[PDB]
Amino acid sequence: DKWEMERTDITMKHKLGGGQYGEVYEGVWKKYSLTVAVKTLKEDTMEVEEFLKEAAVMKEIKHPNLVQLLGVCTREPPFYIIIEFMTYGNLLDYLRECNRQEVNAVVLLYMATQISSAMEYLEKKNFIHRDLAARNCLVGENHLVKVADFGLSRLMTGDTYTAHAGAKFPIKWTAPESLAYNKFSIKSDVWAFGVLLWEIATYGMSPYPGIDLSQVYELLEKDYRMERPEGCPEKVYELMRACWQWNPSDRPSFAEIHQAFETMFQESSI
Numbered sequence: 001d002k003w004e005m006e007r008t009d010i011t012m013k014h015k016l017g018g019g020q021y022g023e024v025y026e027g028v029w030k031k032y033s034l035t036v037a038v039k040t041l042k043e044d045t046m047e048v049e050e051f052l053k054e055a056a057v058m059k060e061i062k063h064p065n066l067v068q069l070l071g072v073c074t075r076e077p078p079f080y081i082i083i084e085f086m087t088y089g090n091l092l093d094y095l096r097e098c099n100r101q102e103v104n105a106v107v108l109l110y111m112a113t114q115i116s117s118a119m120e121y122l123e124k125k126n127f128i129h130r131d132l133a134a135r136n137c138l139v140g141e142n143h144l145v146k147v148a149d150f151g152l153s154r155l156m157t158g159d160t161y162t163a164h165a166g167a168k169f170p171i172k173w174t175a176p177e178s179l180a181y182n183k184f185s186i187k188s189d190v191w192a193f194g195v196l197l198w199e200i201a202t203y204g205m206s207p208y209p210g211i212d213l214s215q216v217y218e219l220l221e222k223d224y225r226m227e228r229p230e231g232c233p234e235k236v237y238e239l240m241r242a243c244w245q246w247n248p249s250d251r252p253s254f255a256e257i258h259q260a261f262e263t264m265f266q267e268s269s270i
């Protein structure tokens, strides 16, 4: 299989942290002199399946704004997934820590255009991500941003995907249909994308500030939504709101979303 490679090609450099099933390393693909990220699996989990699912999905997608699979080591432990190295780490900490004169209003629009471009691509190929959030996007030089963490991504056969009994999702990014019935779709990615914009507009605040996790769903039912963040352009808030429409099919498509950010990003560039 074309993605498989020899464990011995890679040397570990440093632990990176941030892992779910195992440590995530900064390593070096020696023959190419290339720094890479290496996601490893703790031999002692039965989460082998999910770990391998992430890898399977990354073989099937490719886009400038989706973190890129480089190869795998999966003929025996410890399992490795090898991925392009993004030097600045997660988008959430990147927003909290940045210099806002640099990461300014035009950069915010640039970040959203990047993500929506990726998500438009996924939409087109009938994929869903299911974990879109600042914490799962990755940052490179000059505010390059890529969607990452594809463990939960799926190719749908229809327009809907239903998670299995017992699955739990992060309350404040998850569409109501998904919280209530475990139904996911391109449109539930659109909801999370909306929450992701709010994260960008606030430079990484936690959403629904001070609101008890237990009461968020019920609030959504009664049409409570987050208010416009300070400094957030009116058109951007309209889109955020469109993303949070109760009915999935009232939410804009990512092509429409990308189109609107593309426009706004260009006008701001004069």
Ligand SMILES: CO[C@@H](C(=O)N1Cc2[nH]nc(NC(=O)c3ccc(N4CCN(C)CC4)cc3)c2C1)c1ccccc1
Binding pocket: 016, 018, 019, 020, 024, 037, 039, 067, 083, 084, 085, 086, 087, 088, 089, 090, 135, 136, 137, 138, 148, 149
């Ligand atoms: C859990 O999987 C990883 C994953 O797949 N990955 C694939 C992939 N590619 N590049 C990565 N970079 C880092 O992990 C990283 C972390 C901290 C880092 N610094 C810390 C703070 N400083 C400001 C700069 C140096 C610099 C780079 C990752 C993680 C993941 C982690 C976070 C978000 C999305 C995915």
Ligand SMILES: [Mg+2]
Binding pocket: 135, 136, 149
């Ligand atoms: Mg994650």
